[PDB]
Write an enzyme that holds these catalytic residues in place. Structure first.
Site, PDB file in Angstrom:
ATOM      1  N   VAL D  74      31.697 -18.191 -19.373  1.00 10.82           N
ATOM      2  CA  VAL D  74      31.655 -16.767 -19.685  1.00 10.82           C
ATOM      3  C   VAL D  74      30.386 -16.144 -19.128  1.00 10.82           C
ATOM      4  O   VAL D  74      29.278 -16.609 -19.385  1.00 10.82           O
ATOM      5  CB  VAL D  74      31.844 -16.458 -21.235  1.00 10.82           C
ATOM      6  CG1 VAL D  74      32.345 -17.677 -21.950  1.00 10.82           C
ATOM      7  CG2 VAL D  74      30.597 -15.922 -21.847  1.00 10.82           C
ATOM      8  N   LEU D  75      30.580 -15.121 -18.304  1.00 14.18           N
ATOM      9  CA  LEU D  75      29.478 -14.391 -17.696  1.00 14.18           C
ATOM     10  C   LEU D  75      29.364 -13.037 -18.383  1.00 14.18           C
ATOM     11  O   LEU D  75      30.363 -12.324 -18.544  1.00 14.18           O
ATOM     12  CB  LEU D  75      29.737 -14.197 -16.209  1.00 14.18           C
ATOM     13  CG  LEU D  75      29.637 -15.461 -15.362  1.00 14.18           C
ATOM     14  CD1 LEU D  75      30.510 -15.306 -14.115  1.00 14.18           C
ATOM     15  CD2 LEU D  75      28.196 -15.726 -15.005  1.00 14.18           C
ATOM     16  N   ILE D  76      28.148 -12.694 -18.796  1.00 14.13           N
ATOM     17  CA  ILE D  76      27.892 -11.428 -19.465  1.00 14.13           C
ATOM     18  C   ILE D  76      26.978 -10.571 -18.612  1.00 14.13           C
ATOM     19  O   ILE D  76      25.973 -11.052 -18.101  1.00 14.13           O
ATOM     20  CB  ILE D  76      27.201 -11.653 -20.809  1.00 14.13           C
ATOM     21  CG1 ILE D  76      28.002 -12.656 -21.641  1.00 14.13           C
ATOM     22  CG2 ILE D  76      27.029 -10.342 -21.516  1.00 14.13           C
ATOM     23  CD1 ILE D  76      27.501 -12.851 -23.037  1.00 14.13           C
ATOM     24  N   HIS D  82      22.981  -9.559 -10.725  1.00  9.90           N
ATOM     25  CA  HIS D  82      23.278 -10.976 -10.753  1.00  9.90           C
ATOM     26  C   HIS D  82      24.705 -11.248 -11.229  1.00  9.90           C
ATOM     27  O   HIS D  82      25.447 -12.015 -10.619  1.00  9.90           O
ATOM     28  CB  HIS D  82      22.265 -11.648 -11.672  1.00  9.90           C
ATOM     29  CG  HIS D  82      22.167 -13.125 -11.488  1.00  9.90           C
ATOM     30  ND1 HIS D  82      22.803 -14.022 -12.323  1.00  9.90           N
ATOM     31  CD2 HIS D  82      21.497 -13.865 -10.574  1.00  9.90           C
ATOM     32  CE1 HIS D  82      22.525 -15.252 -11.930  1.00  9.90           C
ATOM     33  NE2 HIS D  82      21.733 -15.185 -10.873  1.00  9.90           N
TER      34      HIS D  82
END
Ligand SMILES: O=C(O)CCc1nc2c(=O)[nH]c(=O)[nH]c2n(C[C@H](O)[C@H](O)[C@H](O)CO)c1=O
Ligand SMILES: O=C(O)CCc1nc2c(=O)[nH]c(=O)[nH]c2n(C[C@H](O)[C@H](O)[C@H](O)CO)c1=O
Ligand SMILES: O=C(O)CCc1nc2c(=O)[nH]c(=O)[nH]c2n(C[C@H](O)[C@H](O)[C@H](O)CO)c1=O
Ligand SMILES: O=C(O)CCc1nc2c(=O)[nH]c(=O)[nH]c2n(C[C@H](O)[C@H](O)[C@H](O)CO)c1=O
Ligand SMILES: O=C(O)CCc1nc2c(=O)[nH]c(=O)[nH]c2n(C[C@H](O)[C@H](O)[C@H](O)CO)c1=O
Lengths: 146, 146, 146, 146, 146
Positions: D74-76, D82
């Site tokens: 999971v990317l926040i 970035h």
């Protein structure tokens, strides 16, 4: 620059045909009238839409031998994100087909916001026909390839 | 760093030629004046537009042998999305040609909003000529390649 | 996790050197101090800018043998679209070099809006040094590779 | 659809571990409870961050043999760009690993604006656990692969 | 154009099934009713979601032989960036599978902001069913492939 011994391929889609035609014409006329390309040495195939351009070119590039090829199509922004995604994929695709095959591929793809912008770049309503530029580019890249 | 035995290739497009020239010059002058590169060891080819940069470099990379190559071109934002798509495709293309060939490819591509921004980066109107930086980079990457 | 028998490669660009150094240091210190990596087993090469990272790594990956490599560089948003395009191309490039080679490539690329954001991520002004994280990551990926 | 003879691989990153766990669980429980997958036939490896997912999967895909694999991470969105660049690169990477290997790769990557959105898609706070969907997908793609 | 000897493959996802069905139908009906394609010569496989389209097609393209294939799915913008990333990856994927295999791949992917836009393009609520267009495209590309 003149290329009498050059064989050129031109694949174009058929959507927004009103802008396509002037482009193809300019490309052909310029090659002949200014670079001495022989009409018999210019193949003109066509596909449904821009999405098919890379695939059509790949196929033809395998059947015969050309010194340069011009991909022509016009994508117009609609209500969905479709425009953005096809555009990105097709442009990457054409670049790939050229780098893989070693055959120069000229970008005759118009990615516009509206039909007017397209016609303008096709030489209508006071604009400069970009197909001419593409024609000269095809010739130049073809010779340098040899 | 000096590279007298280095052979460098420079391919540049011809659109926005007013910005291109200063860039090429700076690149050449720097390589010679600061890194001891021999003028005879610097080939300078050219193509129509930035789209052709990757293809032109691939071709040349196959014909002869170079220690490093510099791709130079300048793309200016227009009224359509054309700028965005060519830019993305060309940058990915140059990266590919370099990684496939094993030959260092220096990015001398300017993707600007207007001609002024380009000239500024070409050393005019108080700016720093980026072609210089590219020259030194070519030399460094060329040596480390050996 | 400890990796005394691990050979690590670190390639870093030289732009924004003020942020680069702290990052490299943290990466090295962490690997040694926390994972028992031997200083002699850590090569540290460098290139001009981020654009050269993929190419530099590819070259080095061919010369010697490493268990993991860390690409470090920092790109700062400027006035043009250059930042966006280099960033996208470099990130895709590093991923490619890793997947082609089979050698784990750790992303030590900072793509920021301003120098402050960079320094902050390099451990200065109250921030956490990300080079440390990269160090541990290199070690972990290296072992799992074996 | 049931797949007792199926061997499934699950690689997950460790950032935002609070959202990762529920996802992995749902994926495993669903495969077992609903598709009759044998617990012994489900390998669960892990890597530092999402960037390492493609690389970790490639490695494992080479060591053993699986019928399907699930990449979870999971990317926040943070303060810099970035997020956008890792996301794009990782998604392209997973697709590549799948198409090169011929092994089905299920996308269990969440690219969210904030932790809440993540947890919600992990089944907490009234949401539906997406790991379940991924589980069933892994099973279906695995069988159709045979 | 008629293609009685053509073998067509149609892979479609199952999300937003309410829009999928009308599309598949239109594609099949058009191929038969207008191009003389034999119902027995049209395979229709399916996968969970759009992400699986490229992988499903690759698999099938290897098992049997088709003259053209149509990838159908519909992605709807949600609360996260997921939509953007799946979309970009899937479209690049389909283009790759087509260029690698040499088999024409027709894009029947809808990337919309809301369900309404999808249904409209599926022929409901006064719109034109795009599956028809895809059908004719499949037929044309298939023949030209031979
Ligand atoms: C909407 C839409 N627009 C275009 C377009 O504007 N230009 C185009 O050149 N094509 C458009 N297409 C079609 C697309 O190129 C392709 O032929 C089909 O998706 C099947 O693979 C469109 O669907
Ligand atoms: C508008 C436009 N702009 C540029 C440009 O700004 N820079 C450039 O360097 N080129 C531009 N081009 C042309 C493009 O690089 C290519 O030569 C042709 O598309 C044919 O393949 C443009 O068409
Ligand atoms: C402006 C600019 N910025 C950077 C940067 O911010 N970081 C960086 O790491 N590099 C920057 N570069 C340079 C680029 O990486 C490369 O070295 C040259 O283009 C030649 O190939 C820049 O030109
Ligand atoms: C900030 C940040 N965020 C994440 C994240 O949100 N999710 C993630 O899954 N990872 C994040 N990472 C790390 C990245 O995946 C990788 O492990 C390193 O860059 C070294 O290669 C981040 O650095
Ligand atoms: C949210 C979401 N939306 C879609 C969608 O809208 N269309 C779709 O066609 N699919 C959607 N999916 C699923 C995705 O295609 C895939 O099946 C899984 O991620 C596992 O690999 C979604 O997760």
């Amino acid at each position: 620059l003149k290329g009498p011994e050059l064989r050129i391929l031109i694949v174009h889609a058929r959507y927004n045909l009103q802008a396509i035609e002037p482009l193809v014409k300019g490309a052909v006329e310029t090659m002949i009238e200014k670079h001495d390309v022989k009409l018999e040495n210019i193949d003109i195939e066509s596909v449904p839409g821009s999405w098919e351009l890379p695939q059509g070119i790949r196929a033809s590039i395998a059947r015969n031998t050309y010194d340069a090829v011009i991909g022509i199509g016009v994508l117009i922004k609609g209500s969905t994100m479709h425009f953005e995604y096809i555009s990105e994929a097709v442009v990457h695709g054409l670049m790939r087909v050229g780098l893989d095959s070693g055959v120069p591929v000229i970008l005759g793809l118009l990615t516009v916001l509206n039909e007017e912008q397209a016609l303008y770049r096709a030489g209508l309503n006071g604009g400069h026909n970009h197909g001419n530029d593409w024609g000269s580019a095809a010739v130049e890249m073809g010779l340098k390839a040899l």
